[PDB]
Protein backbone atom coordinates (compact mmCIF):
# COMPACT_ATOMS: atom_id res chain seq x y z
CA UNK A 1 0.00 0.00 0.00
CA UNK A 2 1.00 3.63 -0.52
CA UNK A 3 0.88 6.12 2.36
CA UNK A 4 -1.20 9.08 1.18
CA UNK A 5 -1.58 12.22 3.30
CA UNK A 6 -4.85 14.06 2.79
CA UNK A 7 -4.72 16.95 5.32
CA UNK A 8 -5.06 17.69 9.07
CA UNK A 9 -8.77 18.14 8.16
CA UNK A 10 -10.22 18.86 11.66
CA UNK A 11 -8.00 21.22 13.73
CA UNK A 12 -7.03 20.49 17.38
CA UNK A 13 -9.31 17.57 18.44
CA UNK A 14 -9.58 14.95 21.25
CA UNK A 15 -6.69 12.42 21.58
CA UNK A 16 -7.57 8.79 20.66
CA UNK A 17 -6.59 6.09 23.18
CA UNK A 18 -5.04 2.91 21.78
CA UNK A 19 -4.92 -0.41 23.62
CA UNK A 20 -2.19 -1.52 23.80
CA UNK A 21 -0.75 1.01 21.34
CA UNK A 22 -1.25 2.20 17.78
CA UNK A 23 1.37 0.07 16.04
CA UNK A 24 0.04 -3.26 17.33
CA UNK A 25 -3.50 -2.45 16.22
CA UNK A 26 -2.25 -1.13 12.88
CA UNK A 27 -0.34 -4.32 12.10
CA UNK A 28 -3.34 -6.36 13.23
CA UNK A 29 -5.69 -4.40 10.95
CA UNK A 30 -3.54 -4.33 7.81
CA UNK A 31 -4.15 -7.96 6.69
CA UNK A 32 -7.78 -7.58 7.76
CA UNK A 33 -7.99 -4.62 5.38
CA UNK A 34 -6.38 -6.67 2.61
CA UNK A 35 -9.04 -9.33 3.19
CA UNK A 36 -11.86 -6.78 3.19
CA UNK A 37 -10.64 -5.43 -0.15
CA UNK A 38 -10.34 -8.93 -1.62
CA UNK A 39 -13.90 -9.64 -0.48
CA UNK A 40 -15.22 -6.42 -2.01
CA UNK A 41 -13.46 -7.32 -5.25
CA UNK A 42 -15.06 -10.78 -5.22
CA UNK A 43 -18.53 -9.31 -4.67
CA UNK A 44 -18.09 -6.72 -7.42
CA UNK A 45 -16.90 -9.42 -9.81
CA UNK A 46 -19.90 -11.61 -8.95
CA UNK A 47 -22.36 -8.80 -9.65
CA UNK A 48 -20.49 -7.98 -12.87
CA UNK A 49 -20.61 -11.61 -13.98
CA UNK A 50 -24.36 -11.73 -13.43
CA UNK A 51 -24.89 -8.50 -15.38
Amino acid sequence: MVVEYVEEDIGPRTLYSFEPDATMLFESLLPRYLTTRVYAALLESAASELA
Partner: protein, 81 residues
Protein backbone atom coordinates in the same frame (compact mmCIF):
# COMPACT_ATOMS: atom_id res chain seq x y z
CA UNK B 1 13.15 26.46 81.91
CA UNK B 2 11.86 28.79 79.21
CA UNK B 3 14.87 28.84 76.79
CA UNK B 4 15.01 25.12 76.00
CA UNK B 5 11.21 24.93 75.83
CA UNK B 6 11.19 27.78 73.31
CA UNK B 7 13.95 26.12 71.29
CA UNK B 8 12.01 22.86 71.21
CA UNK B 9 8.92 24.80 70.17
CA UNK B 10 10.80 26.46 67.31
CA UNK B 11 12.20 23.13 66.10
CA UNK B 12 8.75 21.55 66.36
CA UNK B 13 7.12 24.36 64.41
CA UNK B 14 9.81 24.02 61.78
CA UNK B 15 9.13 20.29 61.50
CA UNK B 16 5.38 20.92 61.25
CA UNK B 17 5.76 23.49 58.48
CA UNK B 18 8.30 21.34 56.63
CA UNK B 19 6.03 18.31 56.62
CA UNK B 20 3.02 20.41 55.68
CA UNK B 21 4.80 22.03 52.74
CA UNK B 22 6.18 18.71 51.47
CA UNK B 23 2.75 17.12 51.63
CA UNK B 24 0.93 20.07 50.06
CA UNK B 25 3.48 20.62 47.29
CA UNK B 26 3.64 17.01 46.19
CA UNK B 27 -0.11 16.41 46.53
CA UNK B 28 -0.90 19.50 44.47
CA UNK B 29 1.70 18.38 41.95
CA UNK B 30 0.16 14.93 41.52
CA UNK B 31 -3.42 16.23 41.30
CA UNK B 32 -2.43 18.93 38.82
CA UNK B 33 -0.53 16.35 36.81
CA UNK B 34 -3.79 14.45 36.44
CA UNK B 35 -5.64 17.65 35.50
CA UNK B 36 -3.11 18.78 32.87
CA UNK B 37 -3.09 15.30 31.35
CA UNK B 38 -6.87 15.16 31.17
CA UNK B 39 -7.02 18.60 29.57
CA UNK B 40 -4.26 17.74 27.08
CA UNK B 41 -6.24 14.68 26.00
CA UNK B 42 -9.63 16.44 25.88
CA UNK B 43 -9.53 20.25 26.01
CA UNK B 44 -13.33 20.61 26.25
CA UNK B 45 -13.13 18.56 29.46
CA UNK B 46 -11.40 21.36 31.37
CA UNK B 47 -14.73 22.45 32.85
CA UNK B 48 -15.70 19.06 34.26
CA UNK B 49 -12.22 18.16 35.56
CA UNK B 50 -12.22 21.02 38.06
CA UNK B 51 -14.75 19.37 40.37
CA UNK B 52 -12.58 16.33 41.25
CA UNK B 53 -9.42 18.45 41.20
CA UNK B 54 -10.77 20.99 43.67
CA UNK B 55 -11.97 18.15 45.86
CA UNK B 56 -8.47 16.67 45.97
CA UNK B 57 -6.80 20.05 46.44
CA UNK B 58 -9.45 20.85 49.05
CA UNK B 59 -8.28 17.89 51.09
CA UNK B 60 -4.58 18.48 50.44
CA UNK B 61 -4.55 22.14 51.47
CA UNK B 62 -6.61 21.15 54.51
CA UNK B 63 -3.64 19.22 55.87
CA UNK B 64 -1.40 22.18 55.12
CA UNK B 65 -3.73 24.58 56.90
CA UNK B 66 -4.03 22.32 59.94
CA UNK B 67 -0.26 22.12 60.22
CA UNK B 68 -0.06 25.88 59.83
CA UNK B 69 -2.42 26.22 62.79
CA UNK B 70 -0.32 23.99 65.01
CA UNK B 71 2.83 25.81 63.93
CA UNK B 72 1.28 28.97 65.36
CA UNK B 73 0.23 27.10 68.50
CA UNK B 74 3.86 26.06 68.91
CA UNK B 75 5.54 29.41 68.30
CA UNK B 76 2.99 32.00 69.47
CA UNK B 77 1.04 30.12 72.17
CA UNK B 78 3.52 27.43 73.30
CA UNK B 79 1.35 24.77 74.96
CA UNK B 80 3.87 24.02 77.74
CA UNK B 81 4.86 27.09 79.74
Amino acid sequence: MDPTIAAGALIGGGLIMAGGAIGAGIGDGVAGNALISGVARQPEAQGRLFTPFFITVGLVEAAYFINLAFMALFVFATPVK
